[PDB]
A paper describes a structure:
The first step of this process is the transport of sialic acid to the cytoplasm, which often takes place using a tripartite ATP-independent transport system consisting of a periplasmic binding protein and a membrane transporter. The structure and the thermodynamics of the binding of sugars suggest that all of these proteins have a very well conserved binding pocket and similar binding affinities. While the C1 carboxylate has been identified as the primary binding site, a second conserved hydrogen-bonding network is involved in the initiation and stabilization of the conformational states.
In all of the Neu5Ac-bound structures, a consistent pattern was seen in how Neu5Ac interacts with four of the residues within the pocket. There was one interaction seen in Hi-SiaP (between Asn10 and O10 of Neu5Ac) that was not evident in Fn-SiaP and Pm-SiaP. The binding affinities of Fn-SiaP and Pm-SiaP to Neu5Ac are 45.5 and 19.7 nM, respectively.
Residue numbers in the entry: 3 to 307
Write the structure that this text describes.
Amino acid sequence: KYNLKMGMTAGTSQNEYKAAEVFAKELKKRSNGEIELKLYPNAQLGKDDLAMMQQLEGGALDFTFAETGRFSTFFPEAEVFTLPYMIKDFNHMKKAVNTKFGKDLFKKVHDKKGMTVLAQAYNGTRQTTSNKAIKSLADMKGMKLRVPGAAANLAYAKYTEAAPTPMAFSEVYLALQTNAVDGQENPLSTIKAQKFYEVQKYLAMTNHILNDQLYLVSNITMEELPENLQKVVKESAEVAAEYHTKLFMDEEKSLKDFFKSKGVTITEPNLVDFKKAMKPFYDEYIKKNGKVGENAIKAIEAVRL
Ligand SMILES: CC(=O)N[C@H]1[C@H]([C@H](O)[C@H](O)CO)O[C@](O)(C(=O)O)C[C@@H]1O
């Protein structure tokens, strides 16, 4: 019997965990009990996604979650997948990772980082919450905006003239409650699941970064499994990914109504000022990655539709 482990930053209330439960359910079903997957949420295995991805390389951890743009830590050119206002929708994201650039990235992740991408899911589009109303770009000036330890999110806070305040995901609620920070930044689904709306009187539809979610498996783990069970793992992830995608999609259809009923004021500021403010980070990306970065942008821009 194969007792596998899956770690994640998301809590048990979030859609990521719900889809992971389906993943474990499919694994046990399609393997006739040979494969049993235990879930380890709330980042109880490591600091963040970066720590758990490193655990997959060593084979200590079998499965974990990761955004495609998060691979920029290992392959700098992959940051194009998480550049602010670069990805339009999930259909664009699906096609963006299926470019020659996207396919080469996953291939490099396999060859050099010991991780195999099983499936891709939609993990929501990020918005901005605050204790004060954000109706223009000037309203975010000097606010202590919490962001994850990622360059794209840090840049978004910086070029909106906010004060980038990086901290762990588990420490966000308390920080908002005690007004240590003035606001955070996450998809609507995450905002509801982690109940950030309980401590945030405002919500700005900024739509700056789209998050996908990759079902990663350790290369060592796949090597320890019979070939037919490796196919089970692949198929189980694809099933969960669809369920994963549908969860975020369904909520984003009616979550704005939910928040407004809870007394949260939802603003929809003009985003052409937001998009224009992100230009120096694009220059930053290009200067760091050179022609590789330029061609990557033009390749992903082409499949936006
Ligand atoms: C797979 C994964 O760990 N996603 C996490 C992301 C990424 O760490 C970040 O976007 C960088 O890619 O940040 C969070 O949204 C956050 O801290 O607010 C939590 C979320 O669980």
